[PDB]
Each structure stands twice: as structure tokens, then as C-alpha cells.
């Protein structure tokens, strides 16, 4: 649908959509930009991530509201409407996750050769499989969970070899993989260990950073600390 718009115009419009809090539009513009077939710059990758995280974040929040209402109903024997509407929102959410995973597979990941881009996209792949796992209940749920795990693990392996422990994408990846362990894989000890080791190794590397890099890294470290406080 965006095939007739210039790549640069799609990027410009994605930035305007962000300013206007029109995240569905922002995601459609960035999907159009990805489909031009060129690699994405650092800023462009962030626009893609922000757009879809906001879209799927609203869907996940709505799914959780409806799932809670449905659970309370299954404990007055009301009709099919709550389940039907939860299923409608769930199918929409799955469609957005499949769209993002499709962009990563065709062909963002295979062309990403630098560590920063490859880790970024593998983290995204883990995240969107994690969102699929949050709603999964059927024959393929274990395979969805393993797909998230595998993507996060490859990203971790690259990040530990190629990036300093304070690198914001490395930190955000570890944060999200720890959430995966706690919330999805039923491995709270692994989640806590990962968050603590990540925090401590970043702390020891802050001395190398400029004031601006220090601000970026410590912001994510605080999220790790917030989870450790919640979990311990």
C-alpha cells in the first residue's frame, strides 16, 4: 500500500506520526520503508521498533483486560461475547506479531551483518515471539516459546562477543530475555541471575563512558534494578 511513496517520505511521515501519537500510521509507514528493500539505519530501526511496540502494547493491554473478565466469568453463566471479543483482539495481535516477524525474516535479519543491527533484529524477533507466547494455548505453544528463546540466545551470544556490557541494545536485550525467563519460561531463578549479572557487569564498565552514554546505560540499568526489587 506504500509502494508508491518515496522511502524518504515514508521515514519523514513516520516521524510526524510519532509526534501526533498515531502509532498505527507510524507502523504502516515504517513497514513501507522496510519493504523498499534497503537496510535500515540506527534511527530508522528505532522508529520501526517504537511504532510496532506501541501498536502491540495497546493490543496486549486490551487482551489482558478481556482475559481477566473472561477468567472471572469462568469461576452468572453469560454467553459467548467475552470469549469472542477476546479472540478478536487476540487474532489482531497475532496478525501484528506475524507482520513484524515477516519483516524480520524478509529480509532484515539476513542482511544485517554489523553486530548492532543483527542484535537489534534478533531482540525484536524474541520480543514478538514472546508476545505470541503470552496468548498461546495450543499444540505449538512450546515451539513458540522455543522460537523466542532461540532468537534471544543468538542475540545474547553476539552481544557478549561484540559489544561492551553498557551498550544500550545489549542491556535492553538482557532485560527482555530476563522477563522472558520470569514470565514465559517459568524460570524465575534464571531471570534473577541474568538481571543481576547484567547489572553488575554494566556497573563495572560505566567508568569508560561519556556523560551522555552514561545516562543512556543507567536508564536501562534502573529497569533491571526495578525488576530485581520486584522479584526478590
Amino acid at each position: 500500500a506504500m509502494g508508491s511513496m518515496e522511502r524518504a517520505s515514508l521515514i519523514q511521515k513516520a516521524k510526524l506520526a510519532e509526534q501526533a501519537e498515531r502509532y498505527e500510521d507510524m507502523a504502516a509507514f515504517m513497514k513501507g520503508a522496510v519493504e523498499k528493500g534497503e537496510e535500515l539505519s540506527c534511527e530508522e530501526r528505532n522508529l520501526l521498533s517504537v511504532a510496532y511496540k506501541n501498536v502491540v502494547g495497546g493490543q496486549r493491554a486490551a487482551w489482558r483486560v478481556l482475559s481477566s473478565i473472561e477468567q472471572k466469568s469462568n469461576e452468572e453463566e453469560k454467553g459467548p461475547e467475552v470469549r469472542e471479543y477476546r479472540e478478536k483482539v487476540e487474532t489482531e495481535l497475532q496478525g501484528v506479531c506475524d507482520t513484524v516477524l515477516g519483516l524480520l525474516d524478509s529480509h532484515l535479519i539476513k542482511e544485517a551483518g554489523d553486530a548492532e543491527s543483527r542484535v537489534f533484529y534478533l531482540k525484536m524477533k524474541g520480543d514478538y515471539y514472546r508476545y505470541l507466547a503470552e496468548v498461546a494455548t495450543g499444540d505449538d505453544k512450546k515451539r513458540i516459546i522455543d522460537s523466542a528463546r532461540s532468537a534471544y540466545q543468538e542475540a545474547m551470544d553476539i552481544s557478549k562477543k561484540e559489544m561492551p556490557p553498557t551498550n544500550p541494545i545489549r542491556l535492553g536485550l538482557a532485560l527482555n530475555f530476563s522477563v522472558f525467563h520470569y514470565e514465559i519460561a517459568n524460570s524465575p531463578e534464571e531471570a534473577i541471575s541474568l538481571a543481576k549479572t547484567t547489572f553488575d557487569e554494566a556497573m563495572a564498565d560505566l567508568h569508560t563512558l561519556s556523560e551522555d552514554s552514561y545516562k543512556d546505560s543507567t536508564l536501562i540499568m534502573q529497569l533491571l534494578r526495578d525488576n530485581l526489587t520486584l522479584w526478590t
Binding site: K53, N176, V179, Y182, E183, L223, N227, L230
Partner: peptide, 8 residues
């Protein structure tokens, strides 16, 4: 509550 994943 739910834990914090990455967010800006």
C-alpha cells in the same frame, strides 16, 4: 505487578 521490559 508485571515486570518492566524495555520501554523509552
Amino acid at each position: 505487578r508485571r515486570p518492566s521490559s524495555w520501554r523509552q
